[PDB]
Design a protein around this ligand. Structure first.
Ligand SMILES: *[C@@H]1O[C@H](CO)[C@@H](O[C@@H]2O[C@H](CO)[C@@H](O)[C@H](O)[C@H]2NC(C)=O)[C@H](O)[C@H]1NC(C)=O
Ligand SMILES: *[C@@H]1O[C@H](CO)[C@@H](O[C@@H]2O[C@H](CO)[C@@H](O)[C@H](O)[C@H]2NC(C)=O)[C@H](O)[C@H]1NC(C)=O
Lengths: 49, 49
């Protein structure tokens, strides 16, 4: 559904557990190549993997 | 080095252990989007993940 408007820019506002799950599902579906842009909206940016 | 000739088509001839490692490194560097082609050259195609 996020490809209906051809979205290139995603802001993730989750805690230290859901950020890892969303990143793992992005890597599984393959949406981390150059052309995309993500912002992990938290204070512990290096707390995730 | 495989992006010097802009290679789109890779044939992997490895056993049941190295195929999983090469696929994991392809997923880590992000080369499994639409546009690339792969052939797992073995008899146990469904033996890997
Ligand atoms: C980082 O992600 C952003 C968003 O996709 C992109 O930044 C663009 O970088 C180019 C090259 O300097 C600029 O000309 C554009 O103005 C930037 N903003 C856009 C397209 O909104 C780019 O894809 C990524 N890389 C860099 C180096 O910025
Ligand atoms: C994914 O599968 C498609 C369809 O099976 C392949 O697309 C080929 O594209 C060429 C060039 O447009 C056309 O001859 C046909 O649309 C397809 N060829 C066939 C069916 O023999 C594509 O090569 C595959 N691999 C990718 C995208 O990496």
């Amino acid at each position: 559904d996020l490809e209906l408007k051809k979205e290139r820019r995603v802001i993730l506002d989750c805690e230290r557990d859901k950020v890892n799950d969303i990143v793992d599902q992005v890597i599984t579906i393959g949406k981390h190549v150059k052309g995309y842009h993500y912002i992990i909206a938290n204070l512990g940016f290096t707390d995730g993997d």
